[PDB]
Amino acid sequence: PQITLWKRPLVTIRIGGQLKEALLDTGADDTVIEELNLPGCWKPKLIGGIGGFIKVRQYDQIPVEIAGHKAIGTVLVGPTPVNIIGRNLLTQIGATLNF
């Protein structure tokens, strides 16, 4: 599929059993999901951008399906206004920018 950028590129994802909306973000190195009480071991991390840094929980080897395309990798969980799909998973689904 092709997604234009007139509006925020929000798509449906599946993670930890749940369907969520998330932003496809070519400016994000990593994937950041809103507070979600996932089981499993995790480790502490800090991530930054506009406004500074936040504390997140890093979970590895989490299946994330993005618009029906399966991916699996690292997911950072913390307090975000929007779920963000970053390059670590965008590459797995073969996403490119085109102009």
Ligand X SMILES: CCCC[C@H](CC(O)(O)[C@H](CCCC)NC(=O)[C@@H](NC(=O)[C@@H](NC(C)=O)[C@@H](C)O)[C@@H](C)CC)C(=O)N[C@@H](CCC(N)=O)C(=O)N[C@@H](CCCNC(=N)N)C(N)=O
Q: Which is nearer to ligand X, 39 or 52 (CB)?
A: 52
User: Quick one: CA torsion of 45, 37, 61, 58, rounded to 10 degrees?
Assistant: 0
30 binds, among ligand X, a second copy, none (CB under 5 to 8 A by kind): ligand X
Residue 83 CB, shortest distance to ligand X, in Å, is 9
Question: For this structure, is 25 an active site residue?
Answer: yes
Measured distance CA(15)–CA(80) in Å, rounded: 16
Give the residue from 2, 6, 19, 13 showing the smallest Cα distance to 86.
13
The single residue among 5, 37, 44, 61 that binds a second copy, judged by CB under 8 A, is 5
- How many residues belong to the chain? 99
According to CB under 8 A, which one of 38, 58, 67, 73 is a site residue for a second copy? 67
CB atoms within 10 A of CB 71: 20
Task: Indicate whether 27 belongs to the interface with ligand X (CB under 6 A).
Answer: yes
Report the catalytic residues. Answer: 25
